[PDB]
């Protein structure tokens, strides 16, 4: 009856250390381990509930759970209802809940199907098998179900030990099965491994021997814990709300994030300019010395779009305020700003100060009047630390406090017209734990189970759960506050504006891709920061967060030279680019340093301009179609094994490859090269040529001044002429980088808009082409042609694996006026005059 093998015992003593004769009590088995392993487990036979009346509708399923036997967890729930919809040939959803009472639940809005579902009667289990291969993708009958009011554990079985998600956490792209426990509860706390941070996201992608995948999200906004096995299994712990499942067929990996996208939203589209560098550091006192920044990147040829403030501005450092010393004309500084051609971003809290004489501060005045603070038992509200001393906290779940934000938003604008907020310390970040006042003696503050944060406890680091919110309390809202704040934020840009909103938010949740970006917090400027950065910037593009990247050079310290070149060469592919640096920190301006790590820094930033046309139509194809901005190489080559642990290499869509150097002092690097030619993307000009893979590793040169680009043959890039903005570079002459198959084949697309407009894809209003190469020839296709894309003047084609010379070349039926070839590099460079809108057709021989 115990003899269950030691990788399959799930833990029969979650909640506490627990002594043989107790584990016995509850009816358990005791077997030390040898040498983490749970030494008191469950039977095969351990009480669970019991599946009858099953029943079936033209949605789906329904039935009824009963538990007979109680756990050793207070407040079992006997009776449950099961629901399963067939929603989709690719989605299967199903939801355990109490019939009896509404329970919190999270706010979001061949023909046969892929998958089959199947039901265990005792212990009662859901089974889904892909359909094509028999293959078992859940099967939740292998642990019993507990559903208590606050203590949820839902199990299943892994087809493989590969899972990745689960966000956020500093970890390889894949997670480890091997015991682990893996908390989501929104914190404030530098990434570090092990812990809990900023943002959860409850869903996972499993891949399956021979390439294929699916993805589970568990609707569930409660802290938790997910416990992974290695033989292997998942268990799903969470502290609240109900089991509302989704299971993703795929069959293919990046089928599967789109088919989680569409549940919680596809990735919103950002303006252009927000695809340039950013700039930030707290520590920029006065507007003089903000302005010196601009002049500084902009008198040594670096490229800058938006300018960024950190608390300096503020007055006294609370929200919609400027201080009236270093900032007196923070006004006209934003205004010459525009002027340039450049954005403006700065920081806002949640938090609103509470202290200051009656009157005297209009948002905490006005927040006051509304009711938009978070309450606690006595009715008043909350107070805690932050930045500015005492603070309240907005409940971005209650309407009004949605039209005061928009409200205080709007008329900090009309002061200073900034471009987009930077909302930090929103899981919400609280200096004290829970409250200047302490918290109450409840079960919402001392749960029957506490999952593994930081702390060890809910409050650490931030307000009371049993605080009162406009939906429910803050223990079940708690890792919404980040995405509520986004939401309320997004709005109030698009009014306050009239142009899409750029949010870049700390706390996120999933579906947060909808309203905003994301960058990865206070990570240290280290070698180990800067590789880890890799796998967290992937992990979020898989959660539908394709605006992504972490502080350029590093946040917390004083950040090398070398380390500097380094980040940046691999943080101008972050899809979200920002160099941002501590108070005390040294400077790390590119600008900052010695005349050949500007050279190297200058080529970075230069690539990515360069690259903006493509890394925007990336982020359109994100927009539309749920697709990935940047991702691993699994994404692309599932089918390959070999890129299943590779992630410190990336790619920017299908066909660019980037492989950094990660670590100090290294003049090579050596990365996985899927099966295929790829063309090395120094050998397009820009104001070995080619590795031939069998599937396998190769060690590139790789000094100081480089960074390894290759360019996937079959593939056509649009490029774009220079410019320190986008409202410079956008006017530039394109180009085109066409790399041929063997067979001289490639395919490649540009969706081109104003940059900036709402509605552009429901309103018709943007320009789509398609690039075409077959047999000599490179022609265009018209999908959609708009005034938008009028005047898009394309000046330079070059052709990558051309093997030999060309007689002649041709645009149109005319010889072009030059071009050359290459024979030690295959590469022809050929200047045209066309235009992007216009149908066109060049050729050589
Ligand atoms: C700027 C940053 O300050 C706060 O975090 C700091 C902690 O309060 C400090 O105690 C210290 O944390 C250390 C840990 O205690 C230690 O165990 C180890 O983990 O090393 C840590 C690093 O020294 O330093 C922290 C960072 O300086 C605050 O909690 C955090 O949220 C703040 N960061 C945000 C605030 C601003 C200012 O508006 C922005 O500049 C940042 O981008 C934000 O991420
Ligand atoms: C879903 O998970 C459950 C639990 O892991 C699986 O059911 C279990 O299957 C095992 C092995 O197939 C069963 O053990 C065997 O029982 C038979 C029947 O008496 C016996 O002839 C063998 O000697 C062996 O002991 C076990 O009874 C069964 N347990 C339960 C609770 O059902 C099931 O296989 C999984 N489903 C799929 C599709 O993978
Ligand atoms: C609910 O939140 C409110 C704040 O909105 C809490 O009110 C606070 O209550 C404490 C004492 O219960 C007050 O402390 C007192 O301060 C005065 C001086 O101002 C001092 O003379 C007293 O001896 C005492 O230290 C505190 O001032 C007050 N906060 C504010 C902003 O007025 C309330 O306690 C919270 N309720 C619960 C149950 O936590
Ligand atoms: C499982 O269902 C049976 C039958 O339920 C009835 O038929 C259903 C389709 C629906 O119309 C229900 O409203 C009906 O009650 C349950 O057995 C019945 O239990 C009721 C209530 O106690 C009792 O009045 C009847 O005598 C029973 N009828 C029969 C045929 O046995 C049973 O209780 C359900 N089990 C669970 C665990 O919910
Ligand atoms: C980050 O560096 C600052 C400054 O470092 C000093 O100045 C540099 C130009 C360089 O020459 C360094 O070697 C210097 O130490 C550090 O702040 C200094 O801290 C030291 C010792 O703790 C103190 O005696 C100095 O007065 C400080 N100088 C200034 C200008 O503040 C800071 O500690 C470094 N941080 C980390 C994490 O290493
Ligand atoms: C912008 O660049 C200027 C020019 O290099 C910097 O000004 C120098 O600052 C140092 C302090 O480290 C002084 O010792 C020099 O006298 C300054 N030179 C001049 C010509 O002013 C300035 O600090 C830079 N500003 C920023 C924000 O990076
Ligand atoms: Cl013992
Ligand atoms: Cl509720
Ligand atoms: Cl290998």
């Known amino acids: 009856q115990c003899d269950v093998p030691p990788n399959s015992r799930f833990d029969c003593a979650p909640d506490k250390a627990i002594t043989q004769e107790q584990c016995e009590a509850r009816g358990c088995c005791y077997i030390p381990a040898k040498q983490g392993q749970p030494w008191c487990f469950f039977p095969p036979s351990y009480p669970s509930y019991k599946l009858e009346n099953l029943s079936s509708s033209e949605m789906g399923y329904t039935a009824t759970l009963t538990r007979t036997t109680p756990t050793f967890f207070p407040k079992d729930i006997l009776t449950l209802r099961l629901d399963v919809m067939m929603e989709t040939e690719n989605r299967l959803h199903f939801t355990i809940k109490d019939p009896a009472n509404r329970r919190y639940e999270v706010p979001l809005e061949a023909p046969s199907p892929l998958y089959s579902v199947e039901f265990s009667e005792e212990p009662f289990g859901v089974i889904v098998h892909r359909q094509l291969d028999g293959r078992v993708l859940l099967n939740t009958t292998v642990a019993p179900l507990f559903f208590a009011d606050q203590f949820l554990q839902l199990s299943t079985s892994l087809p493989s030990q590969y899972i990745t998600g689960l966000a956020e956490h500093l970890s390889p792209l894949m997670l480890s099965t091997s015991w682990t426990r893996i908390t989501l509860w929104n914190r404030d706390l530098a990434p570090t491994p ?70 919680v939203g596809y ?58 010393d270093g900032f007196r004309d923070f006004p006209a500084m934003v205004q010459e700003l525009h002027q340039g051609g450049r954005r403006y971003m700065m920081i806002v809290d949640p938090a609103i100060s509470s202290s200051g004489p009656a009157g005297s ?5 006005e927040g006051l009047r509304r009711g938009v603070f978070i309450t606690n038992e006595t009715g008043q509200p909350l107070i805690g630390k932050v930045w500015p ?55 919402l503050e001392n749960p029957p189970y506490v999952p593994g944060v930081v702390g060890g406890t809910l409050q650490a680091a931030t307000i009371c759960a049993s605080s009162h919110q406009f939906l429910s309390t803050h223990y079940n809202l708690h890792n919404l506050y980040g995405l509520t704040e986004a939401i309320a934020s997004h709005r109030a840009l698009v009014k306050a504006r009239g142009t899409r909103p750029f949010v870049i938010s700390r706390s996120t949740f999933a579906g947060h891709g909808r309203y905003a970006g994301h960058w990865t917090g206070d990570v240290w400027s280290s070698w180990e920061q800067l590789a880890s950065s890799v796998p967290e910037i992937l992990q979020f593009n898989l959660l539908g967060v394709p605006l992504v990247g972490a502080d350029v050079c590093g946040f917390l310290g004083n950040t090398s030279e070398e380390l500097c070149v380094r980040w940046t060469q691999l943080g101008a592919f972050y899809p979200f680019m920002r160099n941002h640096n501590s108070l005390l920190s040294l400077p790390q301006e590119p600008y900052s340093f010695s005349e050949p790590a500007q050279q190297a820094m200058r080529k970075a930033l230069t690539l990515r ?26 994404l692309e080559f599932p089918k390959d094994s070999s890129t299943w642990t590779v992630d410190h290499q990336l790619l920017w869509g299908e066909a660019l490859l980037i492989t950094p150097v990660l670590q100090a002092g290294k003049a090579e690097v050596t990365g996985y090269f899927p099966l295929g030619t790829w063309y090395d993307l120094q050998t397009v000009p820009i104001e070995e040529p080619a590795i031939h893979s069998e599937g396998q590793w190769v060690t590139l040169p790789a000094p100081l001044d480089t960074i390894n680009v290759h360019l996937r043959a079959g593939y056509i890039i649009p490029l774009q002429g220079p410019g320190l903005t986008t409202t410079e570079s956008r006017q530039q002459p ?37 690039f075409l190469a077959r047999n000599n020839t490179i022609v265009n296709e018209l999908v959609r042609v708009t005034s938008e894309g009028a005047g898009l003047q394309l000046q330079k084609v070059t052709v990558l694996g051309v093997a030999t010379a060309p007689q002649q070349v041709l645009s149109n039926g005319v010889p072009v006026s030059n071009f050359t070839y ?11 005059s066309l235009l992007m809108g216009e149908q066109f057709l060049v050729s050589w021989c």
């Open 267 to 324: 990735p919103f589209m950002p303006p252009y300019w927000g695809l340039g560098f950013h700039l930030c550091r707290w520590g920029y006192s006065s507007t003089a010395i903000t302005r010196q920044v601009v002049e500084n990147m902009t008198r040594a040829h670096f490229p800058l779009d938006v300018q960024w403030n950190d608390l300096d501005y503020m007055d006294s450092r609370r929200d919609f305020t400027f201080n009236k």
């Open 822 to 832: 290459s024979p030690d590099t295959k590469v022809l460079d050929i200047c045209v």
């Open 734 to 770: 394109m180009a085109l980088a066409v790399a041929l198959t063997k067979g001289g084949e490639a395919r490649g697309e540009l969706f081109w808009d104003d940059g900036e407009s709402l509605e552009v894809l429901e309103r018709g209003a943007y320009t789509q082409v398609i």
């Open 361 to 365: 501060y209009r948002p905490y005045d």
């Open 389 to 443: 001393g005492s603070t309240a906290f907005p409940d971005f779940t209650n309407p009004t406090a949605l039209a005061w934000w928009e409200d205080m938003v709007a008329e900090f604008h009309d002061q200073v017209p900034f471009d987009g907020m930077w909302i930090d310390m929103n899981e919400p970040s609280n200096f004290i734990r829970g409250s200047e006042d302490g918290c109450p003696n409840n079960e």
């Open 194 to 263: 092990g812990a809990n941070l900023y943002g959860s996201h409850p869903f996972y992608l499993a891949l399956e021997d021979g390439g294929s995948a699916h993805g589970v999200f568990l609707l569930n906004s409660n802290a938790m814990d997910v416990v992974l096995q290695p033989s292997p299994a998942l268990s799903w712990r969470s502290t609240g709300g109900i089991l509302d499942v989704y299971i993703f067929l795929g069959p293919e990996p990046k089928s599967v994030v789109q088919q989680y996208l569409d549940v």
């Open 609 to 634: 301009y360069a690259l903006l046309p493509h890394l925007y139509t990336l982020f359109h194809q994100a927009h539309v179609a749920g697709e990935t901005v940047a991702r691993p190489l699994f």
